[PDB]
Amino acid sequence: MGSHSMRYFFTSVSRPGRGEPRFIAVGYVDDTQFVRFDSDAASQRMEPRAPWIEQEGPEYWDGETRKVKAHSQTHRVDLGTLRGYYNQSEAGSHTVQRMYGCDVGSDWRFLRGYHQYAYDGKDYIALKEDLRSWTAADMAAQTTKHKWEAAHVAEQLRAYLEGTCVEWLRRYLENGKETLQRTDAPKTHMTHHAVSDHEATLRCWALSFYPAEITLTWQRDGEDQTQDTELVETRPAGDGTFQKWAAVVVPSGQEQRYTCHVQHEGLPKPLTLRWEP
């Protein structure tokens, strides 16, 4: 089928009043979370969050826990380092975020890798798409860049991202294929709400879809319209699928001129909805 991704997200938040940073790590295949670690949870282990990962054996869980704990310690250090680089007080809480991962394309081979790092919610340092060179946002990140160049960190990451990362992504995709390689096309419908005697709102709903990427667009007499429209952020249903809606306000009696167009990977051709009641 189409392209796929494996991504890991990490957040560390310093606690200057007492104790260690809060650290939360999540792993995804596409739009499906499959593992978590939370430093405040009781297990102190990497934990499963999808059924298809539960079959991995103890060597896997020990290794993932080992890696994620070490990562947490690296962020602990970084929080101290960066507070120094930025000449900040010991009094405040600060945040480190890292995301990394790999995509496979339509040919099921490596497509791209990424590794990005942020401090206090702003870019700090990122690996370029070539997986060979770094983008440093400021002179603090420049110091990190020189550290990481000297240590050949990009070479190490590139080897993972082109090899191990995509090999494990492909394993997960096969072992979880019943869901991970199922596309759930949006279940669509339109509702109608009078706003006055003269105008009505048409709302085009897309429900229970997976993956999350979707496009909803209104047309009037076959031409895209954005004026007098509203689009909500795509939102999780809680059962692993997503929802979205788009609405347009129209002159009452002219509803049939308007069409909602829905594009999604699960739809071989886009759907067109029209109020003709």
Partner: peptide, 10 residues
């Protein structure tokens, strides 16, 4: 499967 064995400090 995470990158390992560890990330370098900043």
């Amino acid at each position: 499967y995470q990158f390992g064995p560890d990330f370098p400090i900043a």
